């Protein structure tokens, strides 16, 4: 309804009308990911959640709903998240890490050692829906 006022985090000054910049970044990432091959999981996931974020932010018109129906932090954190994603896209295009080597092995271990209930273990709440729906498309 009004301006963001304080963001609650130092060094993260409020960006007025962040929806426009966020949409711009999402569009640039969507139109820049065409370099890497389709078949790979990285593209298959970045296109997925970038497109989901673009649709969910274009449906809404204000920050207090954009961050609300995402639930992925404040509308301003998404800005540097998208900027970092674009930087990663560019760097990995420069790296070109594609091509599965013919002599490739990967010893995947499934060790299951129980630990007590009183040791420091990260036990957070469930993720939003898109984080789970992305892996369905990634696998299939």
């Amino acid at each position: 309804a009004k301006v963001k006022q304080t963001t609650g985090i130092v060094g993260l000054d409020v960006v007025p009308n962040a929806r426009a910049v966020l949409i711009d970044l999402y569009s640039k990432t969507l139109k820049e990911i065409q370099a890497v091959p389709e078949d790979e999981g990285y593209r298959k996931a970045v296109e997925s959640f970038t497109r989901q974020r673009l649709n969910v932010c274009k449906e809404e018109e204000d920050w207090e709903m954009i961050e609300k129906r995402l639930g992925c932090g404040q509308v301003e954190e998404l800005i540097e998240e998208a900027r970092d994603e674009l930087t990663l896209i560019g760097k990995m295009i420069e790296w070109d890490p594609w091509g599965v080597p013919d002599d490739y092995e990967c010893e995947v271990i499934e060790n299951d050692a129980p630990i007590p209930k009183h040791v420091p273990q990260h036990r957070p709440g469930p993720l939003p829906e898109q984080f789970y729906k992305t892996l369905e498309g990634l696998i299939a």
Binding site: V100, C106, V108, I109, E110
Partner: peptide, 10 residues
């Protein structure tokens, strides 16, 4: 309980 399986392609 140790499941140690090594991957391989083609």
């Amino acid at each position: 309980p140790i499941r140690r399986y090594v991957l391989t392609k083609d």
